[PDB]
Each structure stands twice: as structure tokens, then as C-alpha cells.
Ligand binder design. Sequence first.
Ligand SMILES: [Mg+2]
Ligand SMILES: [Mg+2]
Ligand SMILES: [Mg+2]
Ligand SMILES: [Mg+2]
Ligand code: NA
Ligand code: NA
Lengths: 74, 177, 53, 136, 175, 104
Amino acid sequence: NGRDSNPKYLGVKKFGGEVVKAGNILVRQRGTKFKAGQGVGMGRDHTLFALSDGKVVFINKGKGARFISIEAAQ
Amino acid sequence: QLKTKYNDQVRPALMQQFGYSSVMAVPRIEKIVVNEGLGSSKEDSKAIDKAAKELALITLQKPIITKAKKSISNFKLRQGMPVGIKVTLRGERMYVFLEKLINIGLPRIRDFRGINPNAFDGRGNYNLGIKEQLIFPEITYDMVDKTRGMDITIVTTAKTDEEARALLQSMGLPFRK
Amino acid sequence: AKDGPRIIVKMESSAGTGFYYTTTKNRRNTQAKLELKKYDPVAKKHVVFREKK
Amino acid sequence: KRTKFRKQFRGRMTGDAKGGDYVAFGDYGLIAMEPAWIKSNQIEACRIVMSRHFRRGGKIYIRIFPDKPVTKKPAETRMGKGKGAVEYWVSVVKPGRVMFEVAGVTEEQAKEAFRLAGHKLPIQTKMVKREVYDEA
Amino acid sequence: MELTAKPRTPKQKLDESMIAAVAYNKENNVSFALDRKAFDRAFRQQSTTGLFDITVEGGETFPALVKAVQMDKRKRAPIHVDFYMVTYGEPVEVSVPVHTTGRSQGEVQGGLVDIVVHNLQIVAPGPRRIPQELVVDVTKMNIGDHITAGDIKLPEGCTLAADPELTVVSVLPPR
Amino acid sequence: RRKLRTRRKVRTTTAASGRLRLSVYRSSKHIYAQIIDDSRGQTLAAASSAALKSGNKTDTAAAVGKALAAAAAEKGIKQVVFDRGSYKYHGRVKALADAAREGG
RNA sequence: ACCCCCGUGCCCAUAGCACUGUGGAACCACCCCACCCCAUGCCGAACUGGGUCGUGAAACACAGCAGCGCCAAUGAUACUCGGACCGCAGGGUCCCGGAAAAGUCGGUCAGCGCGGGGGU
RNA sequence: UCCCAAAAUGUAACGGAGGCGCCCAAAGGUCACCUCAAGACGGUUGGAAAUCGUCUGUAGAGCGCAAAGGUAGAAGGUGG
Ligand SMILES: [Mg+2]
Ligand SMILES: [Mg+2]
Ligand SMILES: [Mg+2]
Ligand SMILES: [Mg+2]
Ligand code: NA
Ligand code: NA
């Protein structure tokens, strides 16, 4: 059926090396793909958001469990 | 009450027959679980209390009324509903019921010849094929509800079948020679 | 949010003395009677609070 | 010939050959030099002619089952959606793909079977021999 | 097969009758580039169970054994070939094909002799003594007779690789 | 079986906590009550009951706790977060706790 | 400084299983008892309380083993950015760079810290 | 919710499939605790499945419904 349709969104919002801020949202997902790392809190829809300022660092331990972190500048 | 002949009449007759360099490697009896059928072709809420009481006087230990496996096929199956009874006997009561069985259970059975000598559980264990329940010293048809069949399984700490059979026999188990 | 003769009924929130509305959708399916709760209005807080009207 | 239970509909696209050796399950084989679609009835025709030519044997290998549902034009118009749920199935064939293979019969007895089947295919083809030994 | 240059750019190879080949073992892995005709004449005989003298431009005769060929599609002419420098004691496992001699007693009766597996890979071929063929009795067979690798004579000093109960040859019924 | 211990590891946050964890190994008759740093895979105080015990193996529960806290004083420890394993916070382990909570 | 054991991390299969050997009171485990604190919708199996013997059999630790897993080149090819063409078309080629998967060689059954303990 | 969608996002058609207009006083909060499907071997109202037990088992289950993502250290199952 050519009926129904859904715009949807999702994806990563703050990539690597990006200097974020306390409140910015990092990535929007549906499950636990990118898991909350150091200085990275996780909303109810599995959304990652920053707790302070820093540099978005990415971390891949061979797929399976992704992690994002933040290293302050100062 | 038992236990003594459990060791004295078993372990010593192993290092003189087989060859154990350790007394801990000597086959032991871990536990005796007893399963009880109920429901399926006989869905009765009154039948629950039946075994629920009998089993609780033959072994001196309240049994748990397990449910279904959450599988629905084509015939009479559901999701969750009491359809079985587990009666684990490990410890002193294990030895009690056990003795009560070797001494009064098997010997007192109509048309009794023995139990299948062939090695059952090839992993070091052994299963029994008990049917009629009117062969026990605790089961009195003069004060019950009906007649069912109970299933007794033997769980031991044996490594091989050659080391299990002997354990059973020495402890107390006749075969059909 | 359709409201009809069917099951469950949007139940109000009241208090002894206090004056507060939690507004919680309940149901009459299984247990439907003991809708007694505890919700602190804008008084001294911590007060006998039920949603049963 | 036709699949036993799938989804229903499909798409369309051709890329270079992928999984067709030269000598598999038998001595002689037949390959495409042209990329196309092979209707199941075409296969059936081939298989059958090959049977005629080989009274006894049954050593005819056909590993190009048709797994592609194609739609069709009901009557006319164009108002309405996905049409012709069941018309025919196809078996995409790319150059290099081994469609047919046989064994047991001589040299002359293969040129014939193959030559015949070939007059039922929507693309040119060729016959080869043993000389390749990739994976086994 | 007199080997000449051996660059990395196939610019002076596609035009002329040259085919890109490589060779290795465990030490050196220098890429080569052999003649088309030479290979198409030699690989036809020794195939994958026979080494040939490979003299590189300068005076370097290095013995090797064909391992995996990556022939071209749409054409019968190969395009790439992998070589393995045989050691001395235990090189790599070689694949030996299965032929058939003597008329069977089931082919006459009405059935047909069918080899289920042409090529058969074994273990430890043994250098200097690589089995270029394999002779398996077929006459002892009748109708529905299955002959596995437990029935194939060993060329002395060779052990099998595949499962002992795998059907190599089988005589199928007519029709 | 080895799940219990790992329910208390992932559970106690290491980063956001900033605090120090204090593990305890009492699956037998020889506790370690080691003390480890959040970030650094090092060890600060860390008690030890294998060095004498005065013929005791159950009483010393209260001792190695007390000891521990005392030891912590010589380094500068104030906040502790407790990470046991298959231990349902009953007797011995609880002794270690109280001893190391009111002695520090 | 030597080794070893126990605990706890980094690392989260190139550090995993299977087979096999070694270990016997320093440590670890099984075992023994267990009316009570506590507890298994039944059973102190496991949780747990109090501790001898015995044993190391099992589990655990270490070591051998790479049969199977896991990881995984070189060479070539698939595909492709860009540049320029061919067939009615499905399609396909050339130049210039990037560059797989699979398979093959081979690679190794870890490595790197902190703390405590007991031995030479 | 998938696919189309051509690897950020987005993107049409009377293109290709399937759902919702609820439900749960607990299916919430928190705190503890348990580990699945399946097959084999062996057992009595069974003789396909299941009830039991012993093995194997990165989950081939489960998560109220549709689907994808995600989950074994739980977002699986129970109790105060
Ligand atoms: Mg196209
Ligand atoms: Mg997209
Ligand atoms: Mg795109
Ligand atoms: Mg638009
Ligand atoms: Na282009
Ligand atoms: Na290129």
C-alpha cells in the first residue's frame, strides 16, 4: 500500500573533535548503540547530552559497544 | 540411621576394585529429584491438592507446583498454568526417603523383577521408572483421592557409567540378572 | 484520548484539607477501588491524598 | 521452475557476473556471453529438449532456479497500483554464469544437446571444457 | 617459463601476451610476470600437482608449485596466478584429481558411472613425490555402490584430508 | 554465578562518583578489603588479614575493618563507597563495614 | 632482586573451547556441622553461620598442545571520485587516483599495572 | 515502523508490507533475587510438544500489541 509515511530524524548531532557545551545534545538514537561515556549523560530515548564543556571524543572497541566522551580544554 | 553403611560399605570397595587415588573422587549421591504429573489430559483443581498432600507425606518436604513452559501448539497447551511437580531431595531427607525406598519401596512391589540394568544417563547419572504409587509405606489407598504415577530420578557425582552402576548396586539396588 | 462507556475512567485528585489535582488515568479492570495514594500539595506537604472521587 | 513461497514483488538491475564457475557437477557446461533475464518456461524448454536428446541418463544439472517475480498489465488504464502479482518468474543471468551442465556423453553428444537448448535462449552462449580448478 | 621484468604497473602487460603472476612461501614475496602462451602450455600438463623450473631474469632458478588461479570471466584466458615455492619436507596441502580406468560392471548393466568429486585434497603430499593423478578401481562397482576415500589406495607416504566416509564415485541408475 | 559481582561493579559509577571504592573478598576465611582508586588502577591503603589472625577467622571481621579505616587516616581518606560481590550484606561483611565507617 | 598465590584493573577472543599434565596445609576449593540472626514461592544446592580431618578428584591457578575457533598479509580483481567515449537498448569500455569482501600465506592460546600474603 | 531513500539529514507516486485511536494498581518508583529458546540421553495418566534431571547453549528467547533499533553486567522473570 502506497499509504502511510514517516519523516523521522535521528543520527549523530555532535561529531568528533567538536567543542561542545553543557546542554548540547550529542547523538540521537533508538536503542543503546552509542553508550554514555565519561561526561556524557543519557536521556530517556537514549539520547546523549553533555554535562560540561569539552571536546567530543569518540571511542570504538571493535564495534558492539560505542562510547562517547568529553575532555575539557582550559 | 544410614550414612555409616553409606561410606563403610561403598568407598573401601572402590580402591580395592577400581583404583581411586582420592577419596573425594569417590562417586557420591548429589540429590534425588522427583517429578509429578498433573493436568494436560486431566485438568482438575481438586487433583492439585491430591499430590500436593501425598508427596508432602512421603518425603516430608513441601513440593513446588511448576507451571507450563509458555508454549502453545495445536492440542491442549496454554501459556502459564500449574502442570507439574518438582520434589528435590538433597541432604538428610534424601538419605531418609532413599532408605525408605530401598528397604520398603522396591522390595514391596507386585510383579517385581528388578530395574533395567542397561546404562541410562551416560554422563554418570541414573534414572528410575516408577509407576503405580500403591507400593509405598506412606501411600494408603484407604485415605486418599485416586491413583497416579510418580517419577524418581537419581543424581550422583559419578564421572562414568562404570562408576555409577556399582555405586547404586552397593548402596541398594537390585537388577534383572 | 477517546472517552466512552468502555473500561478505565480518568479519575480526579483530592485531599483532606489540601487542594490539589494530580489527574491520573486509572482503570476498573482488575483492582479498581483502592485508589488511595499520597501527594503533597502546596501546604505543609506529606498529606493523606487519594484520587478516588 | 517456480519458487514455493516468497514475498511477492521485486525490482530490476544488472551487474557483472558473480558466482558461476566453468566446470561444476559434470564434464561439459554452457555459459552466457550476454546479460539477460531467463524465464522459467525457457529453462523448462531447455531441460526438456536435453531430455529428448538423452534417452537415458538423467545426469542433467540445472543450477539456475528462477527467483524473480515479474508483474504484468491487467487490461489497460493506469489508475491503480502494483499490477500483475503472478505473471512469470525469472533467473537473472550474467556473462560467465553456468546455466547448464551435463556429463557421461561423448563430445558430439554434447554439441547437440547444447546447440539445441541454445536456440531457446534470448542470448548467445558457448560450450567449454575442463581446465579450471578454483575452490573445491 | 623464462621470467623477465616484474614491475607493479600492468601497462606493458595487457597489450603484449603477458600474464601477471606472483610467488611466495614464508620468506621473500617478490611479484613476477610470466608469459601467456608459456603458462597456457605448461599449466595444461602439470596443473596443480607438478612443479616447473622458474628462471628469473639473471640466473635465479626457483622451484614452485601452482596454488590458486584467478581466470577471467567472459573469456577462457586466465588473468592471474598464485605460486607456492615448495620447501623440502612439509609444504602446503595439494589437491589431487580423481580419474577412472577400466569399464565398470554397472555401466554395462544399464547404470552410469558418476564421479561425485573430481578434485580431492589430501594431507602432506610430500615434495619431489607429488601425485599428478589418482587411479581408483571402478569395476568392483555395480548398482548403487558407493566408494569413499577409505577405498582409495594411497600413493605411499600420503594421508587423506576429507572425511573418511565421503562418496567419491557412485554409479547412478539409468534415466 | 559470576554475575552478582558484576552487578555491583557496573552499578557503582566510577567517573561521576569521583569517590574511592573499597572492595572485599570474603569467599573464604581470608579477607583483603583492598582499596582502589577510581581512575588510576592503583591501590592506596588496602588492609591484610593473612599477617597473623590470633587463631581467629570470623572475629577478625571487625578487626580488618577498624585496621583499614585507621590505615586510611595515614593517606587522607574521607569518602568511601563499598563494593562487595556475592555478599548480601549480612554479618561478617557488615562488621567490616561498621568498623570501617565509625573508625574513619 | 626470584618465583608463586590471592584480590582488583587496563584490555573487553591474534588474550576462546576441547584434550592433557603439574600443584597439596602459605593460599584456594570441595567437605563437616548448622536449634538460632539470614534464606531457597520446595529443599541451608546457592545465599549463610560456625570450623577439624581428608582430598586436589571436581572447580580454580599454571604449563604443554594451535585439531577447531579468533585475528589476518602480499598480488590481483569487484566497486568508485574525477576526466573522456560506445550500443536501439538491456549494457559495456578507456585514462587517472582511491580502494573491498572472500580466499590464500601466515600469525599467535595474550600482553601491560597496583595492592596484600607466604616461601628461597 | 521498515523498504524505496541511491551510506549526514531530508526526499514523491492510486510504489512495495504491517500496525495505532490502547493498555498496566501494577507491567510504576526503589531495593533484592533469579537466567532463556532449542536438541540430545533417560523417565510414570505422556509415547509430537510439555511436566523432571543431567549436559550443550552470546541468547538461535523474552520484552502487553506493528516493526526496526536495542538489550546477558538487563530495558527477561519474581518478592518486600
Ligand atoms: Mg542500471
Ligand atoms: Mg538516509
Ligand atoms: Mg546519500
Ligand atoms: Mg517532494
Ligand atoms: Na564516471
Ligand atoms: Na583502477
